[model samples]
Target: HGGTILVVTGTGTGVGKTVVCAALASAARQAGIDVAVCKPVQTGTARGDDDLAEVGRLAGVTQLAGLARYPQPMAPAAAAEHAGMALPARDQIVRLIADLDRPGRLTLVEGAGGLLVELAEPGVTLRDVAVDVAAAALVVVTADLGTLNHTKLTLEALAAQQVSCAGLVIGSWPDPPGLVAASNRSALARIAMVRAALPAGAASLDAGDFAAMSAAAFDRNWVAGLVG
Candidate 1:
């Protein structure tokens, strides 16, 4: 309950986990807290697809580093298997994050994909990493038609691991949300506490714009706990 590491995960792939991480960094910056982001085992790196760079630019912070990157855009285990490269083991990730998490700094470990996706193989998942590090799982979810089932499974997984939900963040909420998105927002709230619903096209905002906008996007009550 007092850890500084926030392990972010998604219901599934392409659910805007990275953007949510960036948003979190921006919010933490506004709160006057030192922040760092770790993107370990980044898959689908084709020469110039720098995910961490985007996070740094959007968050207006330079304290970010990616551990392992692969050329294929797939799960960490599958990408490493395809490229014949090894990944950092479970303990290595835990230790690395612990080292970054000083007394006043907030560190975030954005998961490769969903909770169950294999990160370093040998049968390890992001849930394992979160449990080992005593961090909470910040589940990023969608507000569309098919999100309910996916979000349910993710929440179920966090429960099974005995991991607390930092909160459910709707990473890509529409501007004037449609019926599906609006309905799902109500539906999602009934199941879990929603921390924030970042408006659509949030990733396109510049650093200055993002810094000011993120304050409104995230809940004050929810974000207060992350920094302190």
Candidate 2:
């Protein structure tokens, strides 16, 4: 079998998809798994939304690839239009991920926003790319109110596209989870396998500490089982 390919998507923008990617990559790396991350369409460059860079910094993943870049802090389609550029072709995204797939490696594709966000021209999305590459999705969610609805809807969309969901990750688990956060976490578990819940400030952690946290965040056997 080839290496595991997982497309990382979130319920919506700013749901900590980048941090989840970093944490998961770090966890797999700590397990001595080769980690490669790809961000197909990057937006908000003018406002400094470089997700691949963040993953590299946080997870120490060197095999990072990206296809297109736009300036505005908006959705990829709109951002591309604002920058007077076209989004990368769907095949470009799919071929890049395909080329990254290899035996004994865990290749993670980080989506620009959510699962259905248009990452390429002709309305191609992360879900489409995942389907093209035969990759499962690792959804990143939040431990806050309204998370259930968002999570469920995202899962539904993935299912509608026949994209299997590998698992869920609570992107930000607050220090003192109140009633809502606590209850949502429990309920989210009932929805799917919860791989990990990164701490609220996980993104701010130094690389060394982040790796340590990542190792502790995910189940060891699960991370090890990701690649064979």
Candidate 3:
């Protein structure tokens, strides 16, 4: 069978999707599984490097591709408009993902924005891209003040698309009371069936180091218990 592909989307931009993707790759590698990563459409790319390259370096993945660089730091559609370039073709993206579906390597496909954000043609959302690649999705949300609404909308969109969600990862954020994190965790668990509540600073830990920490923080069998 082909290795599993995880599509990591978030409640919105800047909620740490890349951090979580890299962390998951790190954790899987530590568990003796070979892993690879891909970021299909990246905007605001610098001259020589891209986000997928950084993620690959951090996750220790050898293969990475499918980056369409736009100069403006806006959503893909707007960014493409600014650059006077056409939006990335859906077939091109699907082909890239198909090529990466190798045996024995779990792949983490990180989307650039929320599930419903339009990256290519008018009706093509990130959720469509995920479904095209036959990947399981994982919604990443923050435990900050305004997370409940964001998370709910994200879940609703995923449900409407009939996508299979692997689980949720609650990234901790800077806020007033630590209780916000705990409270959100409980609410998400109750309402949305969240799988893990990773703290904000968890992104700082290296993959190998965080694997041990993840075992301690969650369940020792957490890896096996992952939904997708």
Candidate 4:
């Protein structure tokens, strides 16, 4: 209960929340902070989208946990309906997060798709889970044409729910940045702290190089400050 709990969310699906989670987890581990990651409700299992597995492969995190999995490559609600299963209850998601809390540790709870994506019954969302756990949100974004608007909307929703915005991570930073990408990054920084921007292909890296990239991607002090 004394540890820092962070909910990693995104502007939308496929915005690289998984990679950002791995990178942040790696950076935190390199700083000597105990890191645990939780993915409450996962969809797209049919497409071989095992985000926890990806995190383990990329970050070497052993304390990964998940609640529910659905096979369809759709939102959790539809995915659950398609599979004839039910999404986990809201309290279950909150309790799973609470169980992972500990002193001197950082538990990163990754949401399904976006802040508004339903992760549980009754249209409960990651924003609701963040409220339940009192966890701040580290929003994952992209440096693309529409990112500015998406980022703003996501931030607005978080604010509406009283969820603290930890910062923003550009999921992919292109090599030889284009004008649009550079401008977007500058604009995003103006809205909130631009914590880190992982290289475009950081996901394909082996553990060794991914660790190095993760360590380099985040500011040392900021990563250290995340836990205690």
TM-scores for every candidate against the unseen true structure: 0.95, 0.98, 0.85, 0.99
By lDDT, the better pick of 2 and 4 is 4
TM-score of 4: 0.99
The per-residue C-alpha lDDT of model 2 at residue 228 equals 92
lDDT of 1 by residue, 1-228 (tens): 334888989998878888888988888878877888888768878756567888988887788867888998877877788998887788877777777877777888888878999886687889999998888889999998889999999989889989998778998887788888888999999988888888888899998888877888887556767755
1-228: candidate 4 lDDT, tens digit per residue? 469999999999999999999999999999999999999888899899899999999999999999899999999999999999999999999999999999899999999888899888898999999998889999999999999999999999999989999999999999989999999999999999999999999999999999999999999999899877
Worst 10-residue lDDT window for candidate 3 reads 219-228
Clashing pairs in 4: none
Question: Mind giving the per-residue lDDT tens digits that candidate 2 earns over 37-58?
Answer: 9998888999888999999999
Give the C-alpha miss distance for residue 3 in model 2, angstroms.
0.9
The prediction achieving the highest lDDT against the true structure is 4
Sort the predicted structures by TM-score, highest score first. 4, 2, 1, 3
Candidate 1 Cα lDDT to native: 0.84
lDDT of 4 at 90: 95
Candidate 4, run of 10 with poorest lDDT: 219-228
List clashing residue pairs in candidate 2: none
C-alpha RMSD of candidate 2: 0.9
What would you estimate as the lDDT of candidate 2?
A: 0.92
- Each prediction's total of clashing residue pairs, residues at least 3 apart in sequence or on different chains, is 2, 0, 1, 0
State which candidate, 1 or 2, has the greater lDDT: 2
Off by over 4 Å in 1: 1-3
Best by TM-score: 4
Per-residue lDDT for 14 in model 4? Answer: 94
